[PDB]
Structure formats: C-alpha cells, structure tokens
C-alpha cells in the first residue's frame, strides 16, 4: 500500500540512517573523493599522494635543492559494488513500518560488509604490532594497558599527525579494560581518548613458522615510478616490499613478523627507538618470498640518496641470515588502532541513467557520515511475482600508511 515515491523515499532514508548509525569503524576512516568522477563502470586505480618527506635543508643559499624530492603514491582499486539483491513481497510493502524493517535488514547486511572489510584490512595490514603475555585489564600489576602502549608506540614513532589516534577493542577486551559504557553509546562514542569497541574484529590465528631466516642481504629503497610494458611511466606502490626468506612454510597473509636486529626509527626525527621493527605479511608469493606491508628503508644504508633516506623507518637493512621473529605465536582476537589517514574510504557516485528505461526505477543516494555512494533500484519480475529490489554501495577501502595501523595482541604466552 506504498506508492512508488514513498517506497523510494522510505528506503533511501532507512538505508542512510541505519548505515550511518551502525558503522563505527568506517566513520573513523578518512573519506576520499576521487578528483576524476566520470560515468564509467571500469574500476580505475586511484593514486593518492602520501605525505612528502624531504631532507633537512639548511643554509641561506639553496640552489637546485627543491628538485629531486620524491613524491610517492598509493593505489586503491574500488572494484565492483557491494549489492544486496532481493525481492520485495506484499507483506513488506503493506505499510511503512514493515518496509522500513525490510530495508533496515538489507542495509544492516551492507553495513556488515563495510565494517568487516575495514576491520579485516586493519587487522591484516596493520604493522604497529604490540603484544604482551598478559591479558587486557585494569590490574596494574598483572594486566596489560593496551591503550597506553598503543599511544606510546604511536608517539615514539611520530606517525600521528598530532590529532589523536583511534583505538578499537573487541567486546571481551573492552569489558576487561573496565570501561563504564553507561554514559556511552552502544559502541562507546559519547553521544550528543576516543576508545571504541567493535564486534567485527577478527581473531588472528597463530603462525606455525619456526625456522625462518632472511635468505640474503636485501636493501629496499623508495621508488617513485617505473616503466610498464607499454613504455609509459607508472607509479610504484611504496608500501609493500618483497623479502626473500629461507622458507615461507606456515606463513599466511596477516602474520606479524619482526627481524632480529632491525629497529624502529622516529619517523620525523630519525632516532632509534627501543621497539623492534614489526612488519605484517600481506601476501606469500612463493615458497621463499613474502611481501611485508611497511617497506624497511634503512638509515645506515649508504646506497640511498638523501631524498630517499628521508623516508627511512628502520635502524638497519636485512642481513644475510637474520632471524625472523613471529609475533602472533598464540591465537588472540585482535584489537586494532590507527592514526589519522591510516585508512581511507574511496567512493564515487555509481554511474546511472535515471528515468531513462521504463520498468526500472533507479535512485542514487549518498551516505555523508560514512562517505559511501550508492544506488537503490526496483523492478518488477514475473518470474517471482514480486518486485525485485537492489541496493548497491560502491566503495574501496585503502590502508594508506600501513605503518600507522596497529594491531594489539594480548596473551601471547608462547
């Protein structure tokens, strides 16, 4: 008993409000709108610049010193839209409340997909790994202060533009951390330190690799561009570095690794930190090759030009036979934290031709709080004697600066 316009308005309003309500993580990720918004279905590889770091320029005369600086880009592939294709039945459309219930159920699945993607990307791409044999709690003597350690490691490392980080707990560790939650939203947002809890934080399975050592002396340098097969210049994603190892058995995407001698550096000040350099493998290429999500650029590397050395983030390079420590020795449900632009959500409006083809009524909407662009379409089918309804969300989550994304792993007793 709902007319067409009423169907469209109620559905779009329900989708927008419920997705903006039940997406805590996706609202903490920076919203990126591609500069080139065109009506094309092919997914372009958007190259967003990362912050430029330059060597210290001192003195009155600076001749030919602006030139030669490196500008590096990171790539995001939006891919294909996330759809929820279902049928609208008579009981759904009998009144406004039932229709809102059905549309809420659909948009709840879409918000599931967005949050699951963000949480999994943060857990499997986060490299600022902090572990402790103890469990998270308020007991100073025997428990682990995840928030304090995360803040300390982000401050020491200087990867936070001084706007604060975002800490996400899983409900078990949020309960153990003694957060009152009575004066807080369901997620802990203080409705009208920003510590929140999410139920979609994955459990990071243990890694069984034991005897892993670096295969040979390997040094990585930030490369601005490379020639593709056509001969044109294409930027190089300077996040991931391929490391040759003795063996990669028992290594999977998301495993957090560290190297024996390699240490963090203060990102801006280039001073050696106490904490060992922690990396996350994003892909296992071969039996002897892995791909770690922050690229280890060594200060002591003499082959680096000063412009390249301005991006150094580790104490030393990888030696001939260097032990590869495994941080996720035990199964633990992840707690993640990231700073500023560590995760970006890239989305542009879905190309559509409204009111052009009779039978299909497509309405294009946008969720401003989350930064997702979508389309809502209905059509009638006689193979089901019901109105097909489709909700699409076209977005791409990118983990820009994986060095700024952290994973907290409690109870790594080993």
């Amino acid at each position: 008993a709902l007319n067409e316009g009423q169907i469209v308005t109620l559905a779009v309003d329900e989708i927008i409000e419920t997705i903006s309500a039940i997406t805590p993580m996706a609202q903490k990720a920076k919203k990126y709108t591609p500069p080139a918004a065109s009506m094309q279905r092919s997914s372009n590889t958007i190259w967003m610049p990362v912050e430029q770091e330059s060597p210290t320029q001192e003195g009155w005369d600076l001749t030919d010193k602006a030139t030669g600086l490196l500008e590096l880009n990171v790539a995001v592939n939006m891919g294909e839209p996330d759809n929820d294709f279902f049928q609208l039945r008579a009981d759904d459309l009998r009144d406004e409340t039932a229709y809102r219930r059905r549309i809420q159920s659909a948009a709840r699945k879409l918000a599931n997909n967005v949050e699951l993607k963000v949480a999994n990307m943060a857990a499997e791409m986060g490299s600022l790994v902090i572990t402790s044999p103890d469990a998270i709690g308020t007991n100073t003597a025997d428990a682990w202060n995840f928030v304090a350690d995360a803040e300390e490691i982000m401050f020491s490392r200087e990867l936070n533009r001084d706007m604060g980080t975002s800490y996400f707990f899983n409900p078990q560790d949020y309960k153990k951390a003694g957060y009152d939650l009575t004066k807080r939203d369901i997620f802990g947002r203080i409705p009208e330190d920003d510590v929140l809890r999410s139920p979609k934080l994955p459990v990071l399975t243990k890694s069984t690799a034991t005897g892993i050592t670096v295969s040979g002396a390997q040094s990585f340098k930030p490369v601005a561009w490379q020639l593709d097969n056509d001969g044109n210049k294409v930027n190089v994603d300077n996040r991931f570095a391929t490391v040759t190892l003795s063996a990669t058995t028992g290594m999977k995407r998301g495993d957090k690794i560290s190297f024996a001698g390699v240490k963090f550096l203060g990102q801006m000040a280039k001073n050696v930190l106490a904490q060992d350099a922690t990396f996350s493998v994003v892909r296992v290429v071969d039996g002897t090759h892995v791909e770690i999500t922050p690229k280890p650029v060594a200060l002591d590397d003499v082959s680096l030009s000063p412009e390249q050395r301005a991006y150094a983030n580790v104490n030393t390079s990888l030696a001939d036979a260097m032990a590869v420590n495994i941080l996720n020795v035990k199964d633990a449900r992840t707690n993640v934290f990231w700073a500023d632009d560590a995760i970006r959500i890239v989305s542009q409006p879905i190309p559509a031709n409204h009111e052009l083809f009779a039978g299909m009524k497509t309405t294009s909407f946008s969720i401003p709080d989350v930064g997702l662009n979508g389309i809502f379409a209905t059509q009638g089918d006689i193979s089901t004697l019901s109105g097909l309804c489709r909700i699409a969300l076209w977005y791409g989550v990118n983990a820009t600066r994986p060095e700024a994304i952290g994973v907290g792993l409690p109870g790594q007793t080993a």
């Binding site: 007319n3 316009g5 469209v8 308005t9 109620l10 779009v12 309003d13 927008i16 309405t363 909407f365």
Partner: peptide, 30 residues
Amino acid sequence: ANKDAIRKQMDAAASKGDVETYRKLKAKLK
C-alpha cells in the same frame, strides 16, 4: 501541535519522491 503538520509535509514529500526534503523535515520533527 506543529508536529502533526510537519508529519503531513513529510508524507507529502515522501509521496512526491523527494528524499532530501523528507530527510530535512524528519530532522526538523525530531
């Protein structure tokens, strides 16, 4: 009071098919 009149305006906007006006009026109602 005026809540019942803005509810009628919301219903008219919804029947017309304007999502933006419906959402603005819903925010006004709350």
